[PDB]
């Protein structure tokens, strides 16, 4: 609970000490906070790019895997 009290002081001292640097790191922080608020889909797609290149099981691959299982089982009944 100590940071909640110390947060008002340090944020003030971040803009006073390094005003140009403060306007970016705080400004950049608000972008991603807004991005998740507004479902911009950016950080999600930056994430999906990494999982594709590094061979991870992506979200799209699982849903494609379900389609292959779904399409196979349905024709098995016929």
């Amino acid at each position: 609970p100590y940071l909640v009290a110390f947060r008002p002081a340090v944020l003030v001292f971040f803009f006073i000490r390094q005003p140009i640097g403060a306007g970016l790191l705080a400004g950049g922080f608000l972008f991603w906070q807004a991005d998740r608020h507004f479902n911009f889909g950016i950080r999600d797609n930056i994430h999906n790019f990494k999982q594709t290149i590094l061979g991870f099981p992506t979200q799209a691959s699982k849903w494609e895997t379900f389609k292959q299982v779904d399409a196979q089982k349905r024709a098995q009944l016929v």
Binding site: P1, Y2, L3, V4, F6, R7, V10, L11, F14, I20, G21, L24, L25, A26, G28, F29, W32, Q33, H37, R43, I46, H47, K50, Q51, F56, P57, T58, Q59, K62
Partner: protein, 155 residues
Amino acid sequence: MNLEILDLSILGFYSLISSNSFESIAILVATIMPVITELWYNYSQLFALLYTLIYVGAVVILFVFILSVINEKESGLFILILVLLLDDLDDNESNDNDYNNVYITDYADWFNNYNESDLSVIGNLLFTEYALLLLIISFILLMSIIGLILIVKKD
């Protein structure tokens, strides 16, 4: 709007621009406090306190104790910002997409009529079930007490 993220972004900046041993010590405190606070909420309140009583109360004020006996002497801004912005793109330490983006719940039960603190259980196990761990740790602390004297005491 998790304000925990902003604080780490600041700490991820002063760590790169740290110059003298004043800055590095302040990194340790500025790492402990986000640890202590995020544990006070969320996961475990008992260990949010156990950090402060031991980390800050024993080691960190011993860090600044010895540092006053050591020494006090002495790319740009766009690269440091560029390093942070690329480093900030991915922040999912795990890669189980189902385990991250799906929420769960637990069902409470009334069987434990003997409600006790998490520290009482730890004492009830560390002092009875795993007494050997406790007695070895005492032995290690004994080694340090004799160890620390022999290294420093010249005579």
